[PDB]
Amino acid sequence: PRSLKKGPFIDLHLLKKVEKAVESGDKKPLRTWSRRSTIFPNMIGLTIAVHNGRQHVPVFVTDEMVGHKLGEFAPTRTYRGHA
Amino acid sequence: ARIAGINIPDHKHAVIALTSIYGVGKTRSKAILAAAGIAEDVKISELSEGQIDTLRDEVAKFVVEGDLRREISMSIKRLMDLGCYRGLRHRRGLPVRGQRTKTNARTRKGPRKPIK
Amino acid sequence: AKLHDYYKDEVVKKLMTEFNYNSVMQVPRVEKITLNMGVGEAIADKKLLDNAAADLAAISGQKPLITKARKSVAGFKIRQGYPIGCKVTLRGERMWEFFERLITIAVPRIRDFRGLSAKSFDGRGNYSMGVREQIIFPEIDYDKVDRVRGLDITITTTAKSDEEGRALLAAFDFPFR
Amino acid sequence: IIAKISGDGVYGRLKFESGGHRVQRVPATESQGRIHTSACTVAVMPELPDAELPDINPADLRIDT
Amino acid sequence: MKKDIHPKYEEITASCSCGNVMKIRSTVGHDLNLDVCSKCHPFFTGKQRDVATGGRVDRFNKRFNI
Amino acid sequence: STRRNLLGSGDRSDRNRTYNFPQGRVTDHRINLTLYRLDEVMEGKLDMLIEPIIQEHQADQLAA
RNA sequence: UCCUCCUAAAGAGUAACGGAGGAGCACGAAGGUUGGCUAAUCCUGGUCGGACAUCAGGAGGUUAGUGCAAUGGCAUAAGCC
RNA sequence: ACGACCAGGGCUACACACGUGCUACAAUGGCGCAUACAAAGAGAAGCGACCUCGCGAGAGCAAGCGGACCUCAUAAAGUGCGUCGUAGUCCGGAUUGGAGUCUGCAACUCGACUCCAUGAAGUCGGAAUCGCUAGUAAUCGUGGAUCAGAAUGCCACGGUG
RNA sequence: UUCUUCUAA
RNA sequence: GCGGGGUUGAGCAGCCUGGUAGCUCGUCGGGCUGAAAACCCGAAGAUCGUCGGUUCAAAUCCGGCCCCCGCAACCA
Ligand SMILES: [Mg+2]
Ligand SMILES: [Mg+2]
Ligand SMILES: [Mg+2]
Ligand SMILES: [Mg+2]
Ligand SMILES: [Mg+2]
Ligand SMILES: [Mg+2]
Ligand SMILES: [Mg+2]
Ligand SMILES: [Mg+2]
Ligand SMILES: [Mg+2]
Ligand SMILES: [Mg+2]
Ligand SMILES: [Mg+2]
Ligand SMILES: [Mg+2]
Ligand SMILES: [Mg+2]
Ligand SMILES: [Mg+2]
Ligand SMILES: [Mg+2]
Numbered sequence: 001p002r003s004l005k006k007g008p009f010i011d012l013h014l015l016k017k018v019e020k021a022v023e024s025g026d027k028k029p030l031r032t033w034s035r036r037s038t039i040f041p042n043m044i045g046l047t048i049a050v051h052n053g054r055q056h057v058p059v060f061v062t063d064e065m066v067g068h069k070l071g072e073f074a075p076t077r078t079y080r081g082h083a
Numbered sequence: 084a085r086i087a088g089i090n091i092p093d094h095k096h097a098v099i100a101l102t103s104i105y106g107v108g109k110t111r112s113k114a115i116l117a118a119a120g121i122a123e124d125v126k127i128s129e130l131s132e133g134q135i136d137t138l139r140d141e142v143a144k145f146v147v148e149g150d151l152r153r154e155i156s157m158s159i160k161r162l163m164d165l166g167c168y169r170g171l172r173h174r175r176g177l178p179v180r181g182q183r184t185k186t187n188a189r190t191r192k193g194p195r196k197p198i199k
Numbered sequence: 200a201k202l203h204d205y206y207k208d209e210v211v212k213k214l215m216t217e218f219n220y221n222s223v224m225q226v227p228r229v230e231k232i233t234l235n236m237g238v239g240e241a242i243a244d245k246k247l248l249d250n251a252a253a254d255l256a257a258i259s260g261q262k263p264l265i266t267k268a269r270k271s272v273a274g275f276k277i278r279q280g281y282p283i284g285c286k287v288t289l290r291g292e293r294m295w296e297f298f299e300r301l302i303t304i305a306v307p308r309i310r311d312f313r314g315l316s317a318k319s320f321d322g323r324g325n326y327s328m329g330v331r332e333q334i335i336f337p338e339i340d341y342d343k344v345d346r347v348r349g350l351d352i353t354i355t356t357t358a359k360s361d362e363e364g365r366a367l368l369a370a371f372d373f374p375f376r
Numbered sequence: 377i378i379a380k381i382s383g384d385g386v387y388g389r390l391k392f393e394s395g396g397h398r399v400q401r402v403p404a405t406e407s408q409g410r411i412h413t414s415a416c417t418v419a420v421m422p423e424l425p426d427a428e429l430p431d432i433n434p435a436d437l438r439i440d441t
Numbered sequence: 442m443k444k445d446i447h448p449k450y451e452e453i454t455a456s457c458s459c460g461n462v463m464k465i466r467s468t469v470g471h472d473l474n475l476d477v478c479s480k481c482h483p484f485f486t487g488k489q490r491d492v493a494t495g496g497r498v499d500r501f502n503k504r505f506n507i
Numbered sequence: 508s509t510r511r512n513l514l515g516s517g518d519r520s521d522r523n524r525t526y527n528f529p530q531g532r533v534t535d536h537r538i539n540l541t542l543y544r545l546d547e548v549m550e551g552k553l554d555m556l557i558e559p560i561i562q563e564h565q566a567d568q569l570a571a
Numbered sequence: 572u573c574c575u576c577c578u579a580a581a582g583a584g585u586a587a588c589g590g591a592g593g594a595g596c597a598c599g600a601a602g603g604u605u606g607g608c609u610a611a612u613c614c615u616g617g618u619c620g621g622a623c624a625u626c627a628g629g630a631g632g633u634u635a636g637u638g639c640a641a642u643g644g645c646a647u648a649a650g651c652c
Numbered sequence: 653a654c655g656a657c658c659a660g661g662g663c664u665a666c667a668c669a670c671g672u673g674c675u676a677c678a679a680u681g682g683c684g685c686a687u688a689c690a691a692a693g694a695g696a697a698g699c700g701a702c703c704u705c706g707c708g709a710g711a712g713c714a715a716g717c718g719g720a721c722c723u724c725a726u727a728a729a730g731u732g733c734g735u736c737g738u739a740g741u742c743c744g745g746a747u748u749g750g751a752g753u754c755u756g757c758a759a760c761u762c763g764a765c766u767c768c769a770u771g772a773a774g775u776c777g778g779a780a781u782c783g784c785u786a787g788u789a790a791u792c793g794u795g796g797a798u799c800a801g802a803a804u805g806c807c808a809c810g811g812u813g
Numbered sequence: 814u815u816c817u818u819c820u821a822a
Numbered sequence: 823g824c825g826g827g828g829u830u831g832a833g834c835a836g837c838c839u840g841g842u843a844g845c846u847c848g849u850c851g852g853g854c855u856g857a858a859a860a861c862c863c864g865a866a867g868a869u870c871g872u873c874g875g876u877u878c879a880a881a882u883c884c885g886g887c888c889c890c891c892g893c894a895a896c897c898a
């Protein structure tokens with residue numbers, strides 16, 4: 001996990017989409033390749049799409065997701081079973 | 084003989100017999116006995132009830148046998164209902180911390196399951 | 200008989216108040232507390248039954264009626280006549296002295312106790328519960344025993360409804376919710 | 377090996393796999409390292425239905441006692 | 442009751458860590474010194490503690506300050 | 508007498524495909540199809556590689 | 572060879588290589604008597620308990636029971652201790 | 653475009669089979685305090701004392717050294733004393749939940765380490781099979797190259813023997 | 814004392 | 823018409839007065855071998871022919887059946 005003296009990590013181009021989402025009032029999917037971004041409490045209720053190498057999957061950001069990073073909710077290896 | 088819900092053994096030394104509580108190991112057991120004044124190399128037999136009743140309030144500061152199994156299970160089921168990566172690792176049966184699953188992930192996956 | 204003395208001076212006035220009973224004989228009184236250890240794995244030998252009987256003769260101060268199977272079922276490999284579980288029916292003077300020891304001592308000595316239930320009154324006020332281990336009672340010495348027993352406590356009372364047994368036990372501070 | 381492949385349009389996709397199938401590979405059974413020319417022969421045939429019960433009809437008969 | 446079949450039933454002393462000497466009747470016989478009882482069990486204090494549902498933002502803003 | 512025509516024989520002479528594992532190609536002597544992608548074929552997907560046979564089989568029938 | 576039902580036509584009987592099943596035992600109590608008791612099954616609640624042991628009510632009213640086939644019996648019980 | 657740039661992803665998957673390894677199953681030991689003895693290397697965007705803070709990983713500040721000078725660096729097994737008394741244990745450490753630190757735009761997929769908790773299998777391993785003739789096998793620690801960080805591998809070095 | 818075999822460039 | 827049989831993939835035991843499944847081979851995983859045999863080692867498998875029934879319980883007991891194996895189907 002990241003240091004606490006640095007603060008949590010989010011990307012600027014995600015931050016200039018969340019504040020755009022809070023202002024102009026949209027339920028639009030914000031598709032974002034930043035899997036490494038810690039969810040901020042203003043991101044709660046934002047339908048944001050997180051890349052998983054191939055496609056985007058909508059992560060409806062619940063309150064219970066604030067500590068965790070966006071890539072935990074967009075799994076990249078699609079596994080079903082060997083038989 | 085009885086601390087915090089369970090029946091601690093009576094022949095072991097005090098920093099060893101307290102370890103039976105789900106919630107202390109050896110470092111927190113040395114911190115339980117750090118404020119009860121008890122020398123850490125006495126047995127649970129030949130103690131005092133004035134010492135054992137003092138000893139339970141030391142254990143009552145920290146989270147133990149019944150109360151610790153519930154915060155752990157709430158934290159694991161927190162990951163289940165999120166459906167995060169850590170939650171999928173718990174509800175499939177595979178190791179969560181990113182270990183090897185190609186060879187010898189046996190502690191989560193149980194014994195060997197041959198091809199039918 | 201402390202709680203029966205406690206029944207006749209505070210419980211009767213409380214239940215006549217909140218239910219508006221006509222007659223004082225209409226109040227729910229408890230009738231019997233039945234202590235079963237149905238030990239179905241006592242078909243192995245006598246000693247899993249006759250010792251578990253004596254673990255209940257310590258809890259309730261009575262020798263238990265070692266009961267037998269009513270019919271024969273074959274999923275359990277028992278026949279009609281095998282002794283399969285011992286019970287104790289407690290009435291009067293030794294009912295309340297048990298019911299004093301139950302709600303005071305034996306209930307807070309349960310490992311991971313968070314409270315009893317309130318959906319456990321068998322439709323007609325008779326509160327039927329059950330405990331997981333026989334050593335919640337101080338009667339059972341922890342050292343001298345060997346097997347994790349378990350009994351189920353069944354309180355039978357003359358409540359016609361279901362809430363009237365739910366309110367009778369709350370008069371004796373019974374740990375529900 | 378004979379495998380029945382049950383799916384939609386199996387014969388429309390695998391009727392063009394009839395005939396031989398030559399290989400030229402340095403094999404596993406060859407110990408001098410040389411390369412051998414082998415073959416197999418695949419014959420994809422469809423699932424024709426069963427003949428079913430030919431029930432003799434007592435008007436197509438001629439019974440001589 | 443019957444004259445033989447029942448065990449020795451005696452009024453005893455049941456003290457606790459809240460000092461409550463309480464005289465019950467029982468088959469234990471000896472002077473009983475309990476550990477927790479109905480007076481000192483946290484069914485009325487600590488059961489609102491032990492659920493630990495918690496909030497997530499109030500934990501997250503606690504770690505640092507913007 | 509309908510799988511005898513489909514097999515034909517088993518020798519190296521009556522083939523339809525080859526699989527040259529040194530230079531890694533799958534020819535197809537019905538048309539030409541000398542394409543140098545065999546590890547896509549032998550391991551798996553010939554899904555767009557039965558398809559060129561069907562076009563010239565359609566060309567046997569739309570040119571009728 | 573014996574027992575039970577039907578064919579047997581409302582007393583008894585009544586045939587067929589007619590339709591159905593049983594018996595060639597058991598029991599020193601499974602007999603005698605006195606005292607007492609009331610079944611199957613299902614819903615609900617309940618430690619391990621599971622569709623089903625035991626336990627607690629309730630429904631139910633003999634669908635249970637009889638050492639066994641079938642019929643006629645049986646609560647005063649012929650059933651159960 | 654089979655060339656090229658980028659972003660995220662993959663090489664880190666998991667019904668399983670094998671190879672090479674480390675840590676074990678303990679009493680010739682585990683833990684606790686004390687105390688003795690090395691060799692060989694590395695280092696300037698680097699090695700970083702001392703000092704204060706933190707349970708600890710580490711943080712603040714700042715000497716010294718291109719080094720037989722200063723730093724990394726305390727060698728450990730050992731010896732003395734105490735305890736454990738043959739139990740899945742004061743053996744074992746997997747695994748998991750919190751709570752952290754550091755490196756790095758960035759530790760979710762996937763880093764190492766720390767702290768508290770949890771304490772699986774394992775009680776010396778079937779058929780079989782491997783290494784080794786003397787400072788050897790055995791067991792103990794140390795160092796380096798690679799590297800921002802990331803070894804139980806590799807290449808070196810000594811200690812008991 | 815038993816102890817077989819190695820297809821085709 | 824009367825006997826006997828149906829038991830893992832296959833060839834078969836055992837069903838004993840009902841409480842419970844055995845073998846040879848085949849199969850799986852390792853071992854040996856340059857590799858495949860042979861051999862060594864670890865293994866797993868059954869809803870006991872079908873559908874009813876009687877018993878608390880049926881592979882076993884009873885009744886009917888579908889195949890299969892025999893035997894007898896004759897005096898005219
Ligand atoms: Mg512990
Ligand atoms: Mg008549
Ligand atoms: Mg007549
Ligand atoms: Mg009789
Ligand atoms: Mg009578
Ligand atoms: Mg009689
Ligand atoms: Mg890239
Ligand atoms: Mg790789
Ligand atoms: Mg292995
Ligand atoms: Mg020692
Ligand atoms: Mg240890
Ligand atoms: Mg370095
Ligand atoms: Mg310090
Ligand atoms: Mg030492
Ligand atoms: Mg041992």
Ligand SMILES: [Mg+2]
Pocket residue numbers: none
């Ligand atoms: Mg630890």
Ligand SMILES: [Mg+2]
Pocket residue numbers: none
């Ligand atoms: Mg074990």
Ligand SMILES: [Mg+2]
Pocket residue numbers: none
């Ligand atoms: Mg030599």
Ligand SMILES: [Mg+2]
Pocket residue numbers: 799
């Ligand atoms: Mg490095």
Ligand SMILES: [Mg+2]
Pocket residue numbers: none
């Ligand atoms: Mg041959």
Ligand SMILES: [Mg+2]
Pocket residue numbers: 858859
């Ligand atoms: Mg072989």
Ligand SMILES: [Mg+2]
Pocket residue numbers: 880881
């Ligand atoms: Mg059977």
Ligand SMILES: [Zn+2]
Pocket residue numbers: 457458459460461477478479480481482
């Ligand atoms: Zn108290």
